Write a protein that binds this ligand. Structure first.
Ligand SMILES: [Cl-]
Ligand SMILES: [Cl-]
Length: 124
C-alpha cells in the first residue's frame, strides 16, 4: 500500500525545479509521478519548494478545508506551484494536461506524527 504522507510527496512535491519548465511539464510530471498509471488524474498541483518548507505549513496558518475539515493550513508566504489540469482532448492512456505556473499560498491538510501534509486542498 502507500502512506498518506508518501502519496502527498509523490503527487505534489517537486523540489527538483523552481518552476514549471515549458508547457509540457505537466504531461511529463503526471506520468513520472504515476498519476496517470491506470487513470488520468484530472487535476493535480505540484509544489516547487523543499519538503521542509512544505511540511512547515502544517504549523502555520490554520484555515478551514474546502470539505469542512479543520486540519488545513495555509502557507504564510506564496510558493512556486504548478497546477496540472486535463485538457479537453485528453483520455487514458494518452493523458494530456495544461500547465499553469504561479506563486500562491498553498493550503494543505495535515495529520499523523510527525504532523505532515497528507492532502493538497488548494492554492491562493
Ligand atoms: Cl491538487
Ligand atoms: Cl509572499
Amino acid at each position: 500500500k502507500e502512506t498518506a504522507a508518501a502519496k502527498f510527496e509523490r503527487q505534489h512535491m517537486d523540489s527538483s525545479t523552481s518552476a514549471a519548465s515549458s508547457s509540457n511539464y505537466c504531461n511529463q510530471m503526471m506520468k513520472s509521478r504515476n498519476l496517470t498509471k491506470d487513470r488520468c488524474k484530472p487535476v493535480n498541483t505540484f509544489v516547487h519548494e523543499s519538503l521542509a518548507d512544505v511540511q512547515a505549513v502544517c504549523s502555520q496558518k490554520n484555515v478551514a478545508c474546502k470539505n469542512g475539515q479543520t486540519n488545513c493550513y495555509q502557507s504564510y508566504s506564496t510558493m512556486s506551484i504548478t497546477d496540472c489540469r486535463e485538457t479537453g482532448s485528453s483520455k487514458y492512456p494518452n493523458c494530456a494536461y495544461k500547465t499553469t505556473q504561479a506563486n500562491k499560498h498553498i493550503i494543505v491538510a495535515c495529520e499523523g506524527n510527525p504532523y505532515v501534509p497528507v492532502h493538497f486542498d488548494a492554492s491562493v
